[PDB]
Each structure stands twice: as structure tokens, then as C-alpha cells.
């Protein structure tokens, strides 16, 4: 397949430190039928924990990777609920009292979030603000998130909404309350990507649709991107900003060709589209000259200040209520750059 | 094909007076990603609305309809919301003014709601609210609620969340804000159901998981079953509970067998696994002997009483924060017999 191919093959994967870190926890995934999510469940069950707390809103998500945990429903709880409401999601920490909290709940589509910026905002970074503050005020003793290499200088309103989350979980992060985040590109076939995209339109007779000739994403398998979430996430200590190694970037123009070299559908066009609001041809690399090793060779650290929350939290408020939010998102991120 | 053997063919599909109902209008699908919603999203395009809102939570679901309809893109607007949210909601219908509310968004599925039954209230009950005052205080002419026969005589808690959910709208239709409920029974391979598991364990050799040998469910295409809802709202002068001729029910057991036949299977097993809490063995018929006919053969309008919403109001509001939630069901849906 497609996936084979740009899979990544990490040499550095170390199942036995990721069971270590794992083994009979109660964990708490968020977004947990989501395409990180679900693998982070499957890897929290491969790897020892003792109760997996799977959280999300959509409720075929959810029935879809209790389904496919069905062999061990005695060690999972589906809880329906967006991260979004407080109460309920309290309620939920105090009875479950996880130690371990990893947040892959978000909206990721960029032109979704460019034409819905206050839902984006609202869902990624008040949903993050609520989980992250309930998990603290709960006593959890770790809390991973999920970023993204468009986190990085970003150019659209997802991006920047995730570089606002990486801010306040790493300024949470405290002796008691050990927070790290992870950044990585793009992994191979997840929901709504142009994988999935290119076979639809090949399977209907389209032509693929590409958006410029020139641009690049770097790929990873899901399975090989979450075990490496989960290996930092067992080193961190807290206050960390991880980032992946994602190996050589790949020009979309080749994905699709191979495609359809694979398909023997060669004769379909490929149409050029053009880039749309936000959109980078080349995603920033993410390990800096600078960044700091790690054990493993696939794992960077990457430098990262706290900010004062009591400015942050004006700011979450401002944006709330702001009828400017690009503008609004200015005054947190100043690298953002929205096209 | 499976769904091809248990199609209803309805004699009585009327595409011109759906056109009629929906030309130029605009219209807000609420739920607009989900199997319901994806397809009523569809029927609006295809009878001539002027310009679709299609609002939704699930933002895969939201990306996918709005690619399945990109060669309408100029008359479709993807709206990343929950219906929960009541200030970004009433932005929307202020911005958008839409004439017609087609509201497909709940959550469904039997067991989850049993172990999640303080959400089934919020998204369902309170969802409902939110979205039908908004709509009224808005001014939107006409509202269709999707519905479903496990609301009649509930067993379980999903089931008795609509049955609350058509209560409050009926309760809320008047002179100027005409709304209508329709009610059916499954839909043909639908989201997590029956066809799509089954058509899983065979694919990768594992024996189908039946419930009960005895379990009926009444089955529709989902375009027939859009279609005939969409055909009810245009009829509908408001305060209509709705329901749909389902013709005659299947037991899952046949279905079973017919999709391994399909297959060529004789190597798979069929294990019998329990019926589930609040699990109907046969949900209930649709059409009572006294509900009034309409102009298609296959939909009936069935009686129903409004309640006083001052009462429905505070019993929604205990809803949201009490200990007991079937106790407090039961109190506003008395036929509510909670299978635990
Ligand atoms: N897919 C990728 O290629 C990729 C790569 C790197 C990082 N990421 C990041 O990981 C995150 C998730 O991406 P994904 O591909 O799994 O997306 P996804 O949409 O497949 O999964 C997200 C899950 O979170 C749930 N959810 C969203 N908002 C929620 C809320 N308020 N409460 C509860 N549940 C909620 C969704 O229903 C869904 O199941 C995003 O921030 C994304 O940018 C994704
Ligand atoms: N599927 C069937 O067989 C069937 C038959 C009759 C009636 N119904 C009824 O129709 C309704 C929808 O069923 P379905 O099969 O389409 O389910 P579904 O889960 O496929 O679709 C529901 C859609 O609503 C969305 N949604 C849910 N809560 C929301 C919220 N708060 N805000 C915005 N969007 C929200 C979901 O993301 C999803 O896309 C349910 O009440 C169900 O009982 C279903
Ligand atoms: O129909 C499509 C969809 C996507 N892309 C490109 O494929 C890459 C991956 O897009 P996807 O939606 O998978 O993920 P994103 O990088 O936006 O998170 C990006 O460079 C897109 O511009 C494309 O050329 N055609
Ligand atoms: O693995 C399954 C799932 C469902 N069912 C039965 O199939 C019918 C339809 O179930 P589905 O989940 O499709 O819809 P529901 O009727 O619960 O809305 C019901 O009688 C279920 O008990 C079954 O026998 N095995
Ligand atoms: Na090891
Ligand atoms: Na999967
Ligand atoms: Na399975
Ligand atoms: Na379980
Ligand atoms: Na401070
Ligand atoms: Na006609
Ligand atoms: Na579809
Ligand atoms: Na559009």
C-alpha cells in the first residue's frame, strides 16, 4: 500500500519502557475514537494499563473503538461527553481518578477551522484550558497532549488554536502536575486526509485533486507516531515540548502519482486545485539545530518558556468575546502569520 | 445486496411535492453528517433549496457531506457547532435566517445512552431546547424533528430522551412556528448498526453476534425514509406527530442468515449473545387503528396531547442536575418501563 511505503520504521521504538510507564495505570484518553486517539487506546490496553478511560464526543467514534476493544470491555469505560463540559467531565475525573491524561480531542481541518474560527476556538482551546484545569485541580499526575508540526509558526487559525493549547498545558506544568507535549507531522491515512480523498476519487472515476504541484508533508504510521507520544510522554518530567523526528518529507504530486501507478489508473488526471486560506506547501521541520536530544534518536526537546497565566487567561477571555479573532490570536502567538 | 431485499419500495414517493415544499428555501440541517442528516442534506439539494446550513459536531462527519456535495459548494455552508451552544447557535440562525429546521443530531445508540444517560438527557433533551427556542425566537416558519419507534412505550433511556424531545416540540408549535415529528423504525445499514457489524465479522471470519433468535426490527432505506419525512413536513400545518409505514418487521436471525448466504458462507456460526438492557425483542408497531390517514399510504399522523411547558421547562431543568435521571424520566414519560 501507500502506507507501506512512507511508513517511517523507527529504530527506536522500546516497548518495554512505554509497559513500564503504562502498566496498571487508569488512563484517560480524550478524543479517544479519534485517529490518535484510538490508537492511543489500543496502545494503553498493548501496554499494560489497568482501566482505560475512553472520552468523546461523537458517539460512533466511540462506539467504534469500544467495538474494537471489545475482548477488553472489563477494562474500559465509555464515557460520552465533549471535554467542553465541565461539570460532567469533574464528575467523571473524581469517580475514575485517573493518573494519566492523553488529549487528542480537537478539530484538526484547516479550511473547516478558517471558515468556523470561533469553533475552533472554542474547542481547542477552552477544551483544552477545561480538561487541563480539571485535571490538575484532580490531582492527575501526568497530562500529554497531542500538537502538531502546523503548531509551529503557524499561518491558520488551527494551527495557531494549538500552539495556544501548547502555551497553557506547558505553563500548568508544575512538581505536582507534569505536563509534555508532542508535536508531529502528518500520519498516514487518518481521518479525512488526502489518502482516503485520492482513493475515493479514484474508485468514482475522478480526476485527483491536488492542491500545488510542489507541496510536501511528512508522514508517519499512527502506530509508529503514538508509541513515540507514549515513549515521551514516559520520560518527560514535565514542562516539556517534544518533538518527532518524521524522516524526508514527501511531495503530495508523488503520493499521487503512486497512487495511481497502484491503481493501474493511469489514465486519470491530475487536477491542479490551488492552495487554500492558511495553507503552507512546506510544513516547518520540526528538530531544531538547537532542540535537545534524548534517549531515543526519533525524540528532541524542544526550548519552550512559561507564560503567566493570569495574562493567559485574559487572553483565552478576550478571545471568547473578541469580533477580530485572527487579530485576537496576534496578541497570544506573534509568530502567527495567517495567510 | 441485503438492503436491496429489505427496501420498502413505497408506492407513494412524491418528488414534485417535495420540490414544491423545499424549492428556494432556506434550510438548516442540524445533525447534517449523520445518516439521517447526510441524506435529508441530499434530498434539500436535490428538491431545490436555495441555500443549505448544515450544522454539525463531529467534524469528520461535517468534512465528509460537505465533500459529498461539492459540486453544490456555492449553496452550502459546513457550520462546526453543537446545537448546545445557544449563543453561537442563535449567530447562526440570526445570520442565516433559515425557513425550515430539519433536526437530525441526537445520540442513538441503546447501550451507550444506558451508560452515559446524563449525556443522552443534555444532548438529546436540552440539545432539543436549545435548538427549537432558538428556532421559534428566530422566527424559522417550520421545524421536523426526526423521531424514532423506540420513543413509543421506552424501554430504554434513548428512547425515552426522545420521547421527551417530541413532547417539548409539539408543546412548542403554534400559529406561526409549525412543527412536526416524524417517527420510523431502523434504517438500512445506518451508522454502528446491524448490517455494517455483520458484514464486519464476516469479512474477517468471525461468527455474527445475534442478540436474541426472536428479535424483529422494522426496516427502511434511508432515502425512502428522508424522503417520506420530508414529505410529511410539506403537509404538516403543525402540532403533527408523524408516523411512517414500515411494512412488515424482519427477524435479525434472517437477516443474519441472508447475508451469510450472500456470502456463500457455511463455515460462519451465529452465537447468541443476550438481549441487552432496555433492549425491545420486537419494537413497537407504528400505526395505531385510530390515527388519522394523510394523502400517502405511508404516513399516518398519530394523537398527541401538549403539555404544559412551564412544567416540562422545570422538570428539564431537574433533569440536567439530578441523581435519579430514569425516576425523573418516568415522571415526565409515564409509560416509560425502563428494561434495567
Ligand atoms: N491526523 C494527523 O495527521 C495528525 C498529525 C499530528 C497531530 N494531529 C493532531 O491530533 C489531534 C487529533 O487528530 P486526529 O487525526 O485524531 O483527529 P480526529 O478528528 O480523527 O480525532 C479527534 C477525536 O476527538 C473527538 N473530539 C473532538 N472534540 C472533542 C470534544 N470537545 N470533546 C470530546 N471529544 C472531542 C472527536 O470526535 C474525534 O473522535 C488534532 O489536534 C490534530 O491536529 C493529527
Ligand atoms: N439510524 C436509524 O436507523 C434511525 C431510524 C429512525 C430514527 N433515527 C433517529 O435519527 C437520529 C439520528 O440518527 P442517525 O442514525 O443519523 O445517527 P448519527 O449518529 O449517524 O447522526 C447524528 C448526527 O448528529 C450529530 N450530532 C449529535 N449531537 C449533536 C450536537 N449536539 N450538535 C450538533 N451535531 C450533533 C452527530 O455528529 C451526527 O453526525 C437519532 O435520534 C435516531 O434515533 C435513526
Ligand atoms: O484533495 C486534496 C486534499 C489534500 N491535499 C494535500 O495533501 C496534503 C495533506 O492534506 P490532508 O488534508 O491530508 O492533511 P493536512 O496536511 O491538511 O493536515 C496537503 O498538502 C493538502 O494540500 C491535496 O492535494 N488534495
Ligand atoms: O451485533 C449485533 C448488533 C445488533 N443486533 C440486533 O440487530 C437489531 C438492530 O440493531 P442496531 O444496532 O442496528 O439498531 P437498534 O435497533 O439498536 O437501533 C437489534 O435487534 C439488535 O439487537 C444483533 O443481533 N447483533
Ligand atoms: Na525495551
Ligand atoms: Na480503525
Ligand atoms: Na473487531
Ligand atoms: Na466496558
Ligand atoms: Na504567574
Ligand atoms: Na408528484
Ligand atoms: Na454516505
Ligand atoms: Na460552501
Redesign the pocket.
Known amino acids: 500500500s501507500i502506507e507501506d511505503l512512507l511508513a517511517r520504521k523507527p529504530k527506536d521504538l522500546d516497548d518495554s519502557a512505554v509497559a513500564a510507564f503504562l502498566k496498571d495505570k487508569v488512563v484517560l484518553v480524550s478524543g479517544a475514537g479519534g485517529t490518535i486517539g484510538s490508537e492511543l487506546c489500543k496502545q494503553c490496553i498493548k501496554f499494560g494499563a489497568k482501566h482505560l478511560i475512553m472520552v468523546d464526543h461523537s458517539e460512533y467514534n466511540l462506539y467504534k473503538i469500544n467495538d474494537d476493544l471489545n475482548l477488553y470491555k472489563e477494562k474500559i469505560t465509555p464515557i460520552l461527553l465533549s471535554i467542553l463540559d465541565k461539570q460532567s467531565l469533574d464528575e467523571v475525573l473524581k469517580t475514575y481518578k485517573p493518573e494519566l491524561i492523553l488529549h487528542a480531542a480537537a478539530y484538526?481541518h484547516?479550511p473547516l477551522c478558517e471558515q468556523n474560527p470561533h469553533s475552533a476556538v472554542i474547542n481547542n482551546i477552552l477544551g483544552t484550558k477545561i480538561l487541563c484545569d480539571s485535571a490538575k485541580e484532580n490531582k492527575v499526575a501526568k497530562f500529554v497532549m497531542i500538537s502538531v508540526d502546523?503548531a509551529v509558526r503557524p499561518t491558520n487559525i488551527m494551527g495557531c488554536t494549538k500552539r495556544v493549547c501548547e502555551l497553557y498545558t506547558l505553563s500548568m506544568s508544575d512538581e505536582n502536575f507534569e505536563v509534555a507535549c508532542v508535536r508531529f507531522g502528518?500520519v498516514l491515512g487518518?481521518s479525512?486526509?488526502?489518502?482516503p480523498?485520492?482513493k475515493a476519487q479514484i474508485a468514482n472515476n475522478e480526476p485527483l485533486?491536488?492542491?500545488?504541484p510542489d507541496?510536501?508533508?511528512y508522514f508517519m504510521l499512527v502506530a509508529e507516531a503514538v508509541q513515540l507520544v507514549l515513549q515521551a510522554g514516559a520520560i518527560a518530567k514535565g514542562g516539556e515540548l517534544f518533538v518527532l523526528d518524521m524522516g524526508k518529507p514527501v511531495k503530495?504530486i508523488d503520493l499521487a502519482k503512486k497512487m495511481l501507478l497502484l491503481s493501474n489508473r493511469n489514465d486519470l488526471e491530475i487536477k491542479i486545485?490551488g492552495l487554500?486560506k492558511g495553507?503552507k506547501l512546506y510544513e516547518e521541520l520540526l528538530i531544531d539545530e538547537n532542540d535537545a536530544k534524548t534517549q531515543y534518536e526519533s525524540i528532541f526537546v524542544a526550548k519552550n518558556e512559561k507564560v503567566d497565566l493570569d495574562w493567559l487567561n485574559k487572553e483565552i477571555e478576550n478571545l471568547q468575546i473578541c469580533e477580530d479573532i485572527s487579530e485576537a490570536l496576534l496578541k497570544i502567538v506573534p509568530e502567527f502569520k495567517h495567510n
Not at 192 to 195: F, P, R, T
Not at 209 to 212: D, I, K, M, P, S
Open positions: 484538526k484547516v502546523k502528518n487518518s479525512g486526509s488526502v489518502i480523498k485520492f485533486t491536488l492542491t500545488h507541496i510536501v508533508r503530495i486545485t487554500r495553507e
